[PDB]
Amino acid sequence: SRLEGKIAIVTGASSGIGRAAALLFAREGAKVVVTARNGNALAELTDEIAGGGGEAAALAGDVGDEALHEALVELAVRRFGGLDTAFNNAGALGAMGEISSLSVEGWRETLDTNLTSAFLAAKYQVPAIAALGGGSLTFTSSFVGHTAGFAGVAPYAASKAGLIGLVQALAVELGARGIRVNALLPGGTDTPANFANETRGFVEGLHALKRIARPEEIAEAALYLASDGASFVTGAALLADGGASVTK
Amino acid sequence: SRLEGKIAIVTGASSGIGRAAALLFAREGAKVVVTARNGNALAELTDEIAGGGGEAAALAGDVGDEALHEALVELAVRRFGGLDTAFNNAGALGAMGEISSLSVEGWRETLDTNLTSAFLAAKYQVPAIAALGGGSLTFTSSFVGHTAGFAGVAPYAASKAGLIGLVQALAVELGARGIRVNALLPGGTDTPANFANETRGFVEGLHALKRIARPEEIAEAALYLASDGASFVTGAALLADGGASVTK
Amino acid sequence: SRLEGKIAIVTGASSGIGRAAALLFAREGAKVVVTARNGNALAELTDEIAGGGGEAAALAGDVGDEALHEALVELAVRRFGGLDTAFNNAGALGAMGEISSLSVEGWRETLDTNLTSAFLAAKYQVPAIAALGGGSLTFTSSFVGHTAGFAGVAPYAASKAGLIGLVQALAVELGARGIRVNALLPGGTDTPANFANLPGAAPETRGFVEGLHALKRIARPEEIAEAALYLASDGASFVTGAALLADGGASVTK
Amino acid sequence: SRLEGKIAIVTGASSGIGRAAALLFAREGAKVVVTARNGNALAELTDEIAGGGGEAAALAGDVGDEALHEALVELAVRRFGGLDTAFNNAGALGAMGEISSLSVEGWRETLDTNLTSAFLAAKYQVPAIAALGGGSLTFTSSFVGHTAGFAGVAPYAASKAGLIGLVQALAVELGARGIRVNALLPGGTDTPANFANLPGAAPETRGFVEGLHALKRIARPEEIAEAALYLASDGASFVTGAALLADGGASVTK
Ligand SMILES: NC(=O)c1ccc[n+]([C@@H]2O[C@H](COP(=O)([O-])OP(=O)(O)OC[C@H]3O[C@@H](n4cnc5c(N)ncnc54)[C@H](OP(=O)(O)O)[C@@H]3O)[C@@H](O)[C@H]2O)c1
Ligand SMILES: NC(=O)c1ccc[n+]([C@@H]2O[C@H](COP(=O)([O-])OP(=O)(O)OC[C@H]3O[C@@H](n4cnc5c(N)ncnc54)[C@H](OP(=O)(O)O)[C@@H]3O)[C@@H](O)[C@H]2O)c1
Ligand SMILES: NC(=O)c1ccc[n+]([C@@H]2O[C@H](COP(=O)([O-])OP(=O)(O)OC[C@H]3O[C@@H](n4cnc5c(N)ncnc54)[C@H](OP(=O)(O)O)[C@@H]3O)[C@@H](O)[C@H]2O)c1
Ligand SMILES: NC(=O)c1ccc[n+]([C@@H]2O[C@H](COP(=O)([O-])OP(=O)(O)OC[C@H]3O[C@@H](n4cnc5c(N)ncnc54)[C@H](OP(=O)(O)O)[C@@H]3O)[C@@H](O)[C@H]2O)c1
């Protein structure tokens, strides 16, 4: 029960990290509000949470929409009575390709899904969290655009790096109200988002640990940042990347 | 003549840093293509360059528009024969305020002017630079969102941090073609963009040097990143911030 | 029982962050081996631990001495059967003052205490941890010398930053054998080492130090200990090569 | 004449980056005072400098010795009238190998050469620079221990990272008096210290090292010297407390 008593939003819940996090947080005593575009995946997820003994509510929607973010928090407060924490984990690789071939349409979709989503998440989540008197927001960034670049990925890397800026700003803006704000930066994790999913070997070799994370290991880092154990952690870009940052 | 022979685009040219950079680059032997929204300022700028003995061309436009970026490079190649370097310096504080009061409209304008502009700049500039066989793009970021947060500034901080991600991605993507890509991160500089413009004292105290930069000192750092002296500098987020990053 | 089954060394265990961390680890299930210079302080801590029904062993010595680190690891292995984790936390501000006034003696002593100690810890800790099939080493660095400079603390800042280079090298060297290596970087923490608490201090220092933090308060040592427990925990299985700021937002606050 | 009027100390001046930087600074107008252990190498460099009609003075000594740094500054002030800038560049990979195999002697000697030297440089350089009304100190660090770890180089990585902490502390301490303090962090550079060039090296190392860089090539020493000239130049008047990567994109390349 490392999150006992907490009420959490998890976005990007329908697979890999988000899914493992919603499941873990619920196991550990948090009441979870989940979201993703794929209602069918959400239903398999909320099913699995129920009958593990946990409570979860879902809302299907596009994480780029302002009205989803508002509704999502309204839900948390309706169903469970308030909101303690949010794991803003939605994002996608988006459109990839050599810089000069990319469309501005593709650039804006990627930034909308990965970075505008986080602004809107903050915009609605912060009042409800400030109401319980604290205390946390975590955003899934990436080592990509923070400690490494790759060919073909400029929109994703810019969107992920932007989350670090948003985190530093919010952490200072909300610190006095007792809301911590951190970025979580996975390395290669075993999900459809991973280039691997001879690629597998190449990807594992990127990490000092010489393997790819299970999604549950990234959820555990998200669980830490949402826990009371992280009461003095804010404005941080926590690398849970198996050493990928420091491996060449 | 530290830039002799070079052909440069400078965006955000109509005041402070951009203006000092266009003037400096021209003094130092580069042919300069300048842009900003304010045609009247551009005319005072191109005037001052002429009769210093330098050559400059201008195009007035919104740096968020794809067609400006295309036209701008076409100009450089039309008027001067190609393109060596670009100082992507356009940006603005944009809409400020406590996170939950901000509009998504205001968020998207700020990101458009500060970060989408840079993608579009890259999209058109890289082919013309790859044509001369190299070699540079510099983008004006900020210490804000990289080493510091402030209340009320989340969209600016996210947009500025995003430029660092875009830089790391492009630097790896284009390194093999001989195009260096760097971010330049000013601290407080004496321009209308500076909070100062009892604020003055507070701002100066933010820096280890206990003063605000002249715009010409930031141009000098931009001149270095565009120079042959920076032939082994790429993927770098160069702090020209008077120590603001490390001062508490 | 967050660290049930773990065998941990904790250095700088006689006060502050180190004491809270050795107590916390033991209360959470770990068998703990504790060190500091003050043998009477260690003895009261192990008494408290074994007493609340935990398990601890103590060895007093200078953390800059190679024989002490060797015998620490011998004590964990002997008494408890192995070594899974180390929290290499001992450190001291060392001699402070304007750069041209400092002695090289004072500089070397600061480095030896803060940084040479970490090399010697690693030198003896690594074979024992590797024997178990893997585990972790955590070193207490600081936000000072990583995201901030202050006047008068050049030896301290150098020594703390040096731990981050040691961390990155060892995370790569040891990663394929399952040993994670991280730095933990506290903000202002309410201990004898905090600027505000020195002998010494102007009244206004406490407010100055608190105001350095986005949270606008100085950490209880327990808060830093929970971060160190995170990093030693199985919950940190994919965290290595990191410099984890547990600094209340100090790094980003101006 | 990019440094016309400047009086500069350059350490590690007998080869590599340091030699190219002392030559370059002098060819660009600075009066240069050069040091390394190899007195015959220094003498050929000053001969070349004074000879191309520049001005240089030499003093051979161990960069880990306090008396050497004191006398270096005495030599600049005496011969040239002041001190504006230092390029504290001397460094050595030092003893390398798996962490449990390294001696504490080898560790201390690496640190003394790479990091204690920087403290002693600063201790004597700062009063002389301050006398002039300000200037700069630049220290050659490395991307290793800042954005990368490698196996077998723990002392080197620690010592190089430590320079960044020293930089941040001194930039704050000295900034109000107009002394800028920066670290310069090269990538692979074609000198005797480069992995590929060691005695030693497997054929395939050169390609491995080149491929570490976004530019896909190892730097000529002159390229790193131009970066150091930037940081000593008036063009870097608002650059302090920075760790400038002149590393060909190594930091961001995987
Ligand atoms: N996997 C890695 O190796 C790795 C490395 C670094 C960072 N990350 C980051 O890790 C986070 C979690 O992703 P994962 O690795 O677990 O990949 P994943 O398996 O694809 O999970 C991504 C989640 O984001 C959601 N998403 C995408 N577009 C959305 C939209 N427009 N509206 C609402 N949700 C949307 C998806 O939901 P629907 O498709 O059902 O909407 C899905 O639930 C992401 O932010 C990713 O960028 C992953
Ligand atoms: N000043 C500081 O203290 C400080 C600190 C950190 C970072 N920066 C960054 O430094 C860079 C240069 O700004 P500055 O400090 O020199 O401030 P400034 O005096 O306001 O110059 C900003 C330039 O950006 C242009 N701009 C804004 N919106 C535009 C648009 N929509 N379309 C085309 N151009 C637009 C402006 O041109 P028009 O208005 O004529 O279009 C102006 O030429 C900016 O990216 C800024 O964010 C400044
Ligand atoms: N307090 C803060 O605000 C703050 C901020 C950032 C980083 N840190 C770091 O946090 C870590 C814990 O310090 P703290 O705040 O808990 O202060 P503390 O209360 O003074 O604890 C320091 C501990 O290190 C031990 N130590 C010092 N020199 C030693 C030596 N030569 N040989 C063996 N042990 C030695 C001391 O024990 P004996 O004297 O009994 O040997 C004491 O147990 C240190 O590395 C410190 O630098 C503290
Ligand atoms: N080469 C690279 O790939 C690379 C990468 C990152 C950082 N660096 C750093 O770059 C800086 C310059 O090295 P380099 O590449 O130019 O290699 P280098 O050719 O070996 O030059 C090293 C210089 O430092 C001097 N030195 C070493 N130990 C000394 C001591 N104890 N006392 C006085 N001088 C000493 C050497 O001179 P004597 O032997 O004549 O005294 C030599 O002049 C060093 O700090 C190095 O660590 C190099």
Mind spelling out the 3-state secondary structure of chain C?
CCCCCCEEEECCCCCHHHHHHHHHHHHCCCEEEECCCCHHHHHHHHHHHCCCCCCEEECCCCCCCHHHHHHHHHHHHHHHCCCCEEEECCCCCCCCCCHHHCCHHHHHHHHHHHHHHHHHHHHHHHHHHHHCCCEEEEEECCCECCCECCCCCHHHHHHHHHHHHHHHHHHHHHHCCCEEEEEEEECCECCCCCHHHCCCCCCCHHHHHHCCCCCCCCECHHHHHHHHHHHHCHHHCCCCCCEEEECCCHHHCC
Question: Ligand 1: which of A11, A23, A32, A37 to mutate, judged by most atoms within 8 Å of the beta carbon?
Answer: A37
Catalytic residues of C: 156
Kindly state the tokens that stand for B146: 């990289």
Cβ neighbours for D135, distance < 8 A, ≥ 6 positions apart: D6, D83, D84, D85, D129, D178, D179, D180
Any idea which ligand is nearest the CA of D14?
Answer: 4
Ligand nearest to the CA of A217: 1
Alpha-carbon distance of D88 to D137, in angstroms, equals: 7
Interhelix angle B104-111/A117-132, rounded to 10 degrees, is 130
Calculate the dihedral angle through the C-alpha atoms of C26, C235, C172, D95, rounding to the nearest 10 degrees: -10
- The interface residues of chain B toward chain A in range 200-239, judged by CB-CB distance below 8 A, are 235
- Cβ–Cβ contacts within 10 Å for residue A176, how many? 12
Q: Residue B12 corresponds to which amino acid?
A: G
- Tokens for A154, please give them: 């400029």
* Strand D135-140 to D85-88 pairing: parallel
- What is the CB-side half-sphere exposure of residue D218 using CA atoms within 13 A? 19
Q: Which amino acid is residue D195, in one-letter code? A: F
**Resolution of this deposited model, Å:** 1.9
The CA distance from B112 to B63, in Å, is 8
Q: How many angstroms separate the Cα of B77 from the Cα of each of A3, B128, B178, D155?
A: 60, 8, 19, 51
β-strands C31-34, D179-186 pairing: unpaired
Which residues, 6 or more positions from D165, have their beta carbon under 8 angstroms from its beta carbon? C144, C145, C146, C157, C158, C159, C160, C161, C162
B107's tokens? 């968020």
Give, in words, the CATH class of B1-248: alpha beta
Closest Cα partner for B76 from B91, B66, B86?
B86
- Mapped onto helix, strand or coil, the DSSP state of residue B48 is helix
Cis peptide bond prior to C82, omega within 30° of 0: no
Query: Are the C-beta atoms of A172 and A123 separated by less than 8 Å?
Result: no
Alpha-carbon distance of A194 to A212, in angstroms, equals 9
Tell me the two tokens of residue C10: 């904790």
CA-nearest of D205, C244, B210 to A232 is C244
Nearest to C239 by CA among A244, A74, D149: A244
Give the integer Cα–Cα distance in Å for C167 and C119: 10
Please, which experimental method was used? X-ray
Secondary structure of residue D66 in the 3-state scheme: helix
Contact D254 A208 (CB under 8 A): no
Rounded distance between C-alpha atoms, residue C144 and residue C250, angstroms: 10
Nearest protein Cα to ligand 3, atom 23: C12
d(CA D252, CA D254): 7
Report how far ligand 3's centroid is from the alpha carbon of C61 (Å): 14
H/E stretch holding A36 reads strand A31-36
Please check whether residue C36 is in contact with residue C30, taking contact to mean a CB–CB distance below 8 angstroms.
Answer: no
Residue-range domain boundaries for chain A:
1-248
User: Which of C62, C65, C89, C163, when mutated, tests ligand 3's pocket best, judged by the most ligand atoms within 8 Å of its CB?
Assistant: C89
Contact check, Cβ <8 Å, A172/B148 = yes
Angle at A9 between CA A78 and CA B108, to 5 degrees: 105
| DSSP letters for D200-225 | T--TTHHHHHHTTSTTSSPBPHHHHH
Q: Which of B99, B63, C137 is nearest to A123 (CA)?
A: B99
Which helix H or strand E contains A150, and what residues bound it? Answer: none
Cβ <8 Å between C147 and B247: no
Give the phi and the psi of residue D69 in degrees, each rounded to 5: -65, -40
Task: Find the A147 Cα to ligand 1 centroid distance in Å.
Answer: 20
How far from C122 is each of B125, C88, C125, D204, CA to CA, in Å?
Answer: 50, 9, 5, 31
Q: From edge to edge, which strands make up the β-sheet containing B179-186?
A: B56-60, B31-36, B7-11, B85-88, B135-140, B179-186, B237-240
Nearest to B140 by CA among B191, B97, B70, B86: B86
Cα angle A119, A125, A131; round to 5: 145
- Contact between residue A164 and residue B148 where contact means Cβ atoms under 8 Å apart: no
**Residue A14 among known ligand-binding residues:** yes
* CA C116 – CA C163 distance, rounded (Å): 9
- Give the burial string for D160-178 (b: 16+ CB within 10 Å, else e): bbbbbbbbbbbbbbbbeeb
A149 upstream amide cis, omega within 30 of 0: no
Residue A67 in contact with residue A76, Cβ under 8 Å? no
What is residue D157's DSSP assignment? H
The topology under which CATH files domain C1-254 is Rossmann fold (3.40.50)
Q: List Cβ neighbours of C105 (8 Å cut-off, separation of 6 or more).
A: none
Give the tokens for residue B198: 């009892």
In ligand 2, the atom with minimum distance to the C-alpha of B38 is 40
Burial class (CB in 10 A: 0-12, 13-18, 19+), C65: middle
B177 interface with A at CB cutoff 8 Å: no
Question: For residue C251, which of A207, A144, B248 has the smallest C-alpha distance?
Answer: B248
Beta bridge partner(s), residue A184: A140, A238
Cis peptide before B135 (omega within 30 of 0): yes
Task: Name D127's Cβ contacts closer than 8 Å, sequence gap at least 6.
Answer: C100, D73
**φ, ψ of residue C190 in degrees (nearest 5):** -75, 80
C-alpha–C-alpha distance, residues C180 and C240, integer Å: 5
Query: A143 in contact with B at a CB cutoff of 8 Å?
Result: no
Q: Is D156 a catalytic residue?
A: yes
DSSP A207: S
Residue A64 is classified by DSSP as T
DSSP state at residue D249: T
Q: CB under 8 Å to A181, separation ≥6 — which residues?
A: A136, A137, A138, A139, A167, A170, A171, A174, A234, A235
Distance of alpha carbon B128 from alpha carbon B121, whole angstroms: 11
